[PDB]
Amino acid sequence: MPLLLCPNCQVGMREVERRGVLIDVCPQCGGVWLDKGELEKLLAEAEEVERRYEEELEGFYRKEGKPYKRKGFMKLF
Amino acid sequence: LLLCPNCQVGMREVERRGVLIDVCPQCGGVWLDKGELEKLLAEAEEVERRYEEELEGFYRKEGKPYKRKKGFMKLFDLF
Ligand SMILES: [Zn+2]
Ligand SMILES: [Zn+2]
């Protein structure tokens, strides 16, 4: 389990656990590497955040008798 | 033509909402250049802003107090 080499700088990247997600940041250029399982944790929470926003808007529209077209951020991934 | 820090193989380029993400086709990890990470954070902020302004309007018309949730940027400030 050694450090990972930035693909730009060829220097060893810093690994930090933030909000429960392991991210690797190049100290020289600041690019970021996410292993697939860590990307998945980030996107699962983002999906929750978006769901709550859209359900809250869904209720306001439903009271008005207007349909709410679902948008977004998850659409990026 | 950037090498995966795991697999030492060429990563593929994927463009989403103007953000360029490098994806290893073997292990599936992702690389964001600092400039692309900046663009991702700006897009999350715009998506969040659109939700919060619509909700701010609904609460104002119902006369109920509202404080912004800032749900995306609370997650993405990890960068
Ligand atoms: Zn670097
Ligand atoms: Zn890989």
Residues B24 and B45 both lie in one domain: no
**E strands, B1-79, in order:** 12-16, 19-23, 30-32
- Residues from chain A contacting residue B69 (CB–CB below 8 Å): 52-53
Tell me whether residue A68 is exposed, middle or buried, using C-beta atoms within 10 angstroms of its C-beta: 0 to 12, 13 to 18, 19 or more: middle
Q: Could you list the residue range(s) of the whole structural domain that residue A24 is in?
A: 1-33
Alpha-carbon torsion, ordered A50, B60, B50, B38, to 10 deg: -90
Stated in angstroms to one decimal place, the resolution of this structure is 1.8
Asked, for residue A73, whether it belongs to a domain, the answer is no
Do B41 and B71 lie in one domain? The reply is yes
- The reply to whether B17 and B55 lie within a common domain is no
Are A49 and B30 in contact (CB < 8 Å)?
Answer: no
The response to whether B7 counts as a known ligand-binding position is yes
Two tokens, residue B67: 């404080």
**Residues B79 and B51 reside in one and the same domain:** yes
Structural domain total, chain A: 2
Yes or no, beta carbons of A7 and B6 under 8 Å apart: no
Do B45 and B64 share a domain, yes or no?
yes
Beta bridge partners of B21: B14
